[PDB]
Amino acid sequence: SIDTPNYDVQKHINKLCGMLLITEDANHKFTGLIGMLYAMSRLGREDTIKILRDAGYHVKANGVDVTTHRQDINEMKFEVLTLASLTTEIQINIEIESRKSYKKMLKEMGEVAPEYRHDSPDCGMIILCIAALVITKLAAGDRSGLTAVIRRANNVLKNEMKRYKGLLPKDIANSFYEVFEKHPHFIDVFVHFGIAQSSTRGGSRVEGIFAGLFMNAYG
Numbered sequence: 001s002i003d004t005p006n007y008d009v010q011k012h013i014n015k016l017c018g019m020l021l022i023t024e025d026a027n028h029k030f031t032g033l034i035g036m037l038y039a040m041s042r043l044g045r046e047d048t049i050k051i052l053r054d055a056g057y058h059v060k061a062n063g064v065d066v067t068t069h070r071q072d073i074n075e076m077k078f079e080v081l082t083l084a085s086l087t088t089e090i091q092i093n094i095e096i097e098s099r100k101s102y103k104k105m106l107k108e109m110g111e112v113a114p115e116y117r118h119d120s121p122d123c124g125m126i127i128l129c130i131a132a133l134v135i136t137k138l139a140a141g142d143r144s145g146l147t148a149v150i151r152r153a154n155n156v157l158k159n160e161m162k163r164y165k166g167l168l169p170k171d172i173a174n175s176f177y178e179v180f181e182k183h184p185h186f187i188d189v190f191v192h193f194g195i196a197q198s199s200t201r202g203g204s205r206v207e208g209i210f211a212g213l214f215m216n217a218y219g
């Protein structure tokens, strides 16, 4: 069974990416999956299914809905997603860890600027820039291109790394190497996502960085 998020959970996945990005010494074990879930909510449920079926994969679609979970950790209310690939506990521990780093940020700077927040609209796209680097290096059938991925990420995502303490290229890249090796159908989803993304036109810097990195996968 594959999780097929639709456009309605896009804003939620974006905030999930940014929660990981604000976390200092963040456990990026699930970042590859979360990044792939984001691209899927940008494509939508119908396109994702069509992409997978046409590429010869037998896929059992699972609807992604927003659930409210309550747990005593103060009685706290959490907004979570119905994912077969990601438990309610994993999602809630992501929020708990990021709220700790947010509290630390508030103590140091006083008020968090919009571009330093977990709900900045470019958070999901920041994560997907690492995936664009990983995709270029998969052909070698190993992980020898990792040193080059970190080298490029430090240069191309220089401003983004100043904005987020949780933007750790080695960890995020290892997460995408594992997810593309374990679930090769995500490579098809991501390739289809990047071509549809170059059609996007707006004022986002990271949308532009992604469009440039994606075209570098050709030549």
Ligand SMILES: N[C@@H](Cc1ccccc1)C(=O)O
Pocket: 019, 095, 098, 099, 102, 118
């Ligand atoms: N003030 C923040 C608290 C928070 C930080 C980090 C993650 C989740 C929540 C908010 O409501 O968005």
